[PDB]
Ligand binder design. Structure first.
Ligand SMILES: [Ca+2]
Ligand SMILES: [Ca+2]
Ligand code: NA
Lengths: 223, 58
């Protein structure tokens, strides 16, 4: 997260870290046994880390649970990045309390201008490299489909949306993928891609979760 | 034809922080870099062994 702030220990209880020997992506806990992340975050031997703040130190509220299943959307396209969503089942049910909690799925899509909370352990620099120990947070608004398409000509599908600030300086970045974009208590987005990070006229692009609610519910229930 | 082993490492547009290997021609060795998760170019390997087998001596 570039241009954000320190969330505070366990203030984003649904935020999880995907670990494959090191942190490589984020994710969102939607129930005691399931996590939503990005399709491009599919990796072998995933271990989901819940209740995390400092990703490099054992603080006492962590729950490390291996992924028992990783279902990438059947229509995911690695070239266009369309349908960039993946569901991860936890090998054992996570112990839910205040520090580890699920985030509700949306009942409807969020409108342009809606303020949301984006979080993750990704790069905090637009130019250069600096990865945080603790979870970072960023308040950013949903941008119009028109502005999103203008920013990324011929790249925005109906399953993507832009969020951030056109002047640059505030955005999600490498290491944040798969993480949450929560608006009014609902998971509206999944950190997906963009042209660099926090660059002027290049807001972050996110998977539109509101288009997959029925698929998520049915897929979870059939696995 | 252009040697893909001589192309600079490509992170891509996706925002994951996946550690991959690329052949650094200037240094003459396979080095690590951050891959974003999709749209990988060919000078991108999952292990140092794969990188050396494919690009060693380039
Ligand atoms: Ca920790
Ligand atoms: Ca290296
Ligand atoms: Na802490």
């Amino acid at each position: 997260i570039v241009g954000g702030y320190t969330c505070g220990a366990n203030t984003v209880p649904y935020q999880v870290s995907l670990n494959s020997g090191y942190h490589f992506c984020g994710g969102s806990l939607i129930n005691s046994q399931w996590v939503v992340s990005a399709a491009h975050c599919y990796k072998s031997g995933i271990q989901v880390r819940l209740g995390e703040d400092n990703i490099n130190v054992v603080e006492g509220n962590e729950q490390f649970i291996s992924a028992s299943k990783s279902i990438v959307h059947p229509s995911y396209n690695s070239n266009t990045l369309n349908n960039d969503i993946m569901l991860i089942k936890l090998k054992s049910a996570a112990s839910l309390x205040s520090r580890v909690a699920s985030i509700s799925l949306p009942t409807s899509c969020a409108s342009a201008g809606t303020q949301c909370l984006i979080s993750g352990w990704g790069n905090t620099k637009s130019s250069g490299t600096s990865y945080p120990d603790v979870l970072k947070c960023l308040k950013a608004p949903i941008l119009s489909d028109s502005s999103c398409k203008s920013a990324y000509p011929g790249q925005i599908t109906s399953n993507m949306f832009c969020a951030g600030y056109l002047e640059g300086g505030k955005d999600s970045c490498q290491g944040d993928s798969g993480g949450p974009v929560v608006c009014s208590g609902k998971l509206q987005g999944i950190v997906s891609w963009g042209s660099g990070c926090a660059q002027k006229n290049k807001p972050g692009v996110y998977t539109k979760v509101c288009n997959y609610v029925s698929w998520i519910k049915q897929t979870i229930a059939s696995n | 034809r252009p040697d893909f082993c001589l192309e600079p490492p490509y992170t891509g547009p996706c925002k994951a922080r996946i550690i991959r290997y690329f052949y650094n021609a200037k240094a003459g060795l396979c080095q690590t870099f951050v891959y974003g998760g999709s749209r990988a170019k060919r000078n991108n390997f999952k292990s140092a062994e794969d990188c050396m087998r494919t690009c060693g001596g380039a």
